[PDB]
Write a protein that binds this ligand. Structure first.
Ligand SMILES: *C(=O)c1ccc(-c2ccc(C(=O)OCC)cn2)nc1
Ligand SMILES: *NNC(=O)c1ccc(-c2ccc(C(N)=O)cn2)nc1
Ligand SMILES: Cc1ccc(C(C)C)c(O)c1
Ligand SMILES: CCc1ccccc1
Ligand SMILES: Cc1ccccc1C
Length: 9
């Protein structure tokens, strides 16, 4: 999940 969101940055 972290990566799925972190892709924004
Ligand atoms: C949410 O973005 C997210 C993505 C990927 C993972 C995750 C956890 C563990 C592995 C892995 O290969 O573990 C082997 C011990 C890969 N991806 N978690 C959360
Ligand atoms: N929000 N995105 C990031 O912080 C981020 C974007 C892209 C990458 C990344 C990592 C590794 C490669 C590669 N060719 O090995 C390319 N892009 N990391 C973080
Ligand atoms: C991304 C990953 C994990 C959590 C828990 C702390 C609920 C959030 C947002
Ligand atoms: C694509 C997720 C990510 C974001 C920032 C740094 C590394 C990786
Ligand atoms: C590992 C991680 C966690 C939360 C936001 C961004 C990144 C790259």
């Amino acid at each position: 999940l972290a990566a799925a969101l972190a892709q924004a940055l």
